[PDB]
Amino acid sequence: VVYPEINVKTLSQAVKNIWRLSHQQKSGIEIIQEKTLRISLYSRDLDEAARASVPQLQTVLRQLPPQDYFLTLTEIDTELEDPELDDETRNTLLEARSEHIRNLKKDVKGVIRSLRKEANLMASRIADVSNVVILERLESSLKEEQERKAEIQADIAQQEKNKAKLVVDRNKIIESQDVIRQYNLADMFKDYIPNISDLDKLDLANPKKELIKQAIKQGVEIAKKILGNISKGLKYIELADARAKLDERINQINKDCDDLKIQLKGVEQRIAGIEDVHQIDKERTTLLLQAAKLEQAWNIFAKQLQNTIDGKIDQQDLTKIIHKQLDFLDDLALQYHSMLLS
Ligand code: NA
Ligand code: NA
């Protein structure tokens, strides 16, 4: 027979993590929010049962060794060897050991009921935490939100790119207005913006010619395309009118990007919430492994003492079984005593 190796820190830390996750998680499903609180509540109850079982079973097992029959049965059986008085000594000593054995069975029956009581209790705790169903179509939900996150991020990226193009198209028209305003082109050329050929004839330095000549050509070409002008010349008021439409469209894109960034926080919070629920299931799996080993240990402990008192009573064998079972509990207490959670 071998006892399970149990880490109660891994058990208790997992219960601690379920509590933390069940309260910060914000997937916004609500029934999941309630079910996660059920798991944390029953998880803490399981942890309480595990912590109480150790000093409970220690108390029960420690009552057996100090009994008189452990020592006196060895003294009876050792003196029940040599040629003795067959009635006065031998018959009487047999009836004395039968009295001791009846008390030994009665005590060992009692500690077995205590071990079974802890096993059945831990089994009820394991049932409570495990029976809460949380992963029904949660892999489906995680896929849905990440798909919605993908197209929102894709929309923001396109919107930002379409805005970036409109920003330069706007800035090209602004540069055209600046050279018109700086050199008073509206004063010379009435109503319509001067052509590229007309700008050459102006009294300007050669670097200044190419400066304004490129500005006008670029801003006019853009403005004409926006107003649907593929025929006539461009007026100054039409240049400002062309900019006004771009400012309206850029402002509209900024508003649309703000609404998308609100939705993006929504999906990211819900994906984070779904990931915490997935983590709660993994923390629950971790603690149940340790919890199942406690149930197993007590049922092993019970049947081990049962087999000692089924047939012939090996007084001194039982003393080893108790001390081995006690050393196992001493270890569990050592873990709880020096436990540092986080
Ligand atoms: Na409780
Ligand atoms: Na129940």
Residue numbers in the entry: 12 to 353
What did the publication describing this PDB structure actually write?
We have unraveled structures of the soluble components and the pore assembly of the YaxAB cytolysin from Y. enterocolitica. The crystal structures show an atypical fold, comprising a head domain reminiscent of ClyA family toxins and pronounced coiled-coil and foot domains unique to the YaxAB system. In line with our finding that the isolated YaxA and YaxB head domains form spoked oligomers in solution, the YaxB head domain in isolation was sufficient for recruitment to membrane-bound YaxA. Together, our biochemical data support a role for YaxA as the initial membrane-interacting subunit of the toxin, able to bring the lytic effector YaxB to the target cell surface. Therefore, we propose that this class of toxins defines a new structural family of α-PFTs.
The orthologue PaxB produced better diffracting crystals than YaxB and thus served as template for molecular replacement phasing (the two proteins share 40% amino acid sequence identity, whereas YaxA shares 18% and 22% sequence identity with PaxB and YaxB, respectively). YaxA and PaxB crystal structures were determined using single-wavelength anomalous dispersion (SAD) on selenomethionine-derivatized proteins. Because our PaxB model could be well resolved, missing merely the N-terminal 11 residues, we will utilize these coordinates for most structural analyses throughout the manuscript. All three proteins adopt similarly elongated, α-helical folds composed of a five-helix bundle head domain and a two-helix-coiled-coil stalk, tapering to a narrow turn in the case of YaxA, while connecting to an additional α-helical domain in the case of PaxB. For the PaxB head domain, Z-scores ranged from 7.4 (soluble-monomeric ClyA, 3.8 Å RMSD) to 13.3 (pore-protomeric ClyA, 2.4 Å RMSD; PDB code 2WCD12). Our monomeric PaxB structure, while complete, might hamper a true comparison with the protomeric YaxB unit, since it is derived from a different species. However, it is noteworthy that the foot domain represents the region of highest sequence conservation between Yersinia and Photorhabdus orthologues (60% sequence identity; Supplementary Figure 12b, highlighted in black box), indeed pointing to a common principle of pore formation.
